[PDB]
Structure 1
Amino acid sequence: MDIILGIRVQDSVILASSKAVTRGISVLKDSDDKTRQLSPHTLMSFAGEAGDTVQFAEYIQANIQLYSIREDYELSPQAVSSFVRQELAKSIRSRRPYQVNVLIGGYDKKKNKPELYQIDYLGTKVELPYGAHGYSGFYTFSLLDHHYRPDMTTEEGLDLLKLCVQELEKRMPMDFKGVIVKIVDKDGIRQVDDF
């Protein structure tokens, strides 16, 4: 796990998530996709404790997919993020909490707005123009504080992201093996393949 970032521009939300999976002194995998599609216009990235991360992500996915079928309708990004928050807020007071931090990027089709929610394992939710979990945030927040503009295009957003990934590859002590980038907009979710 380790690096997950989110940026919300004019008409989309972009999630970038590192590909490395490490145990001890071995990088076991360098193409890991730290993400699950919850609904056609909502994507969730995740980082934290081994095992917990995927188990939690897939559990949320199953619940949202179940809701979709039952009502023949897609929950808004805000509604999904509140559902997720509540699950984590329950979890933190369980016998064994989920040690998982998430970013939820969705396009709200009723409002025609992109939306980015940052939620930690405590169930601490915040809606943001850009977000990060882990040590990443210690570089990217100030970088984005400087270079980010509210009206940027998807393409300007991707360049802003390249800046972030460049800084992280320069200053971060670990080799996180690059990122998988996904765009969420009015047409759903797609993956950029050469990043």
Structure 2
Amino acid sequence: MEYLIGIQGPDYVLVASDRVAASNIVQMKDDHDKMFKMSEKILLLCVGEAGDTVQFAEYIQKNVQLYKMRNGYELSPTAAANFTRRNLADCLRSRTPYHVNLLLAGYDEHEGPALYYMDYLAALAKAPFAAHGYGAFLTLSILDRYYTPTISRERAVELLRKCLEELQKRFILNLPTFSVRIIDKNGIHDLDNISFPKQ
């Protein structure tokens, strides 16, 4: 399924995602965005069951912006992660459960960067790394054997490039293009994608 690679640097998190939208037979949109801007210092990545993903993501997004606007300051990324976890857990046992996996990664001035994992049951997890979708099994081995606690930005893009090209070689369907972003003291910034010739 759709991919979400978030890796935590010494003072940054590099979060990555694909840009493919398909309905069970073919890619309708070639520039899909499954990543949502929680605030200036936090972003959300939600995948899994489609349709539920988008409205749930905007509901959480508007909840967190409601918070940052009613109080004048945005949540800490850990607080936002726990908020989303509580919301989805409360809606879990309800008669309309939300079977959507999720990722959450951001930065805080007081402590530093953070990254959080959510299944379609939404149990929390903080790691210097994260992956979602059916390719997660494929690139988890790269994620482990190709990671050090001191990933540098250029080596970070090289490592995500390695994971990306292993997806392109191994994963069954086609992932043409990828969104990857840097989160640091200056906030959120967007980086480029990859492509591969076959001629």
Shared topology, TM-score over 0.5?
yes
Cα–Cα, structure 1 residues 101 and 191, in superposed 2: closer, same or farther, change >3 Å?
Answer: same
In structure 2, give the amino acid aligned to 1:56: F
Kept after mapping to 1: 8 A contact 2:102/2:122:
no
Structure 1's consecutive aligned runs of 4 or more residues displaced over 4 angstroms after TM superposition are: none
8 A Cα contact 1:180 1:191, kept in partner: yes
Are 2:43 and 2:105, in contact at CA under 8 Å, matched by a contact in 1? yes
Deviation at 1:63? 0.4
Give the match's secondary structure for 1:135. coil
* Structure whose residues are more often strand by fraction: 1
Match of 1:59 in 2: 59
The equivalent residue for 1:142 is: 141
**Distance (whole Å) between structure 2 residues aligned to residue 86 and residue 176 of structure 1:** 32
Question: Which runs of no fewer than 5 residues in structure 2 stay unpaired?
Answer: 195-199
Aligned residue number for residue 173 of structure 2: 174
Alpha-carbon distance, 1:193 to partner: 2.8
Match in the other structure for 1:80? 80
Return the alpha-carbon distance in structure 2 between the equivalents of residues 173 and 67 of structure 1.
41
For residues 87-121 of structure 1, the C-alpha deviation after alignment (integer angstroms, 9 at most, x for no partner) is: 1111221212112211111011111x221111112
Correspondence for 1:161? 160
Q: Return the offset for 1:155.
A: 2.2
The offset of 1:28, in angstroms, is 0.2
1:15 CA drift (Å): 1.3
The answer to whether the Cα contact below 8 Å between 1:11 and 1:153 also exists between their aligned partners in 2 is no
- How far did 1:194 drift? 4.3
Distance 2:144 2:30 in 1: 30
TM-score normalised by L of structure 2: 0.93
**AA in 2 matched with 1:127:** K
Q: Measure how far apart 1:17 and its partner are.
A: 0.9
Q: How many residues align?
A: 194
For 1:38 and 1:178, locate their aligned partners in 2 and report how far apart those are by CA, in whole Å: 23
Match of 2:95 in 1: 95
RMSD (CA atoms): 1.3
Alignment of 1:1-195 (within 5 A): 2-111=2-111, 113-195=112-194
Residues 2-11 or 76-85, more deviating: 2-11
Residue 4 of structure 2 aligns to which amino acid in structure 1? Answer: I
Identity %: 45
Paired residues of 2:14 and 2:180 also in contact (CA < 8 A): yes
For residues 110-159 of structure 1, give each alpha carbon's deviation from its aligned partner in whole angstroms, at most 9, with x where no partner exists. 11x22111111212110011111121221222112111111112222111
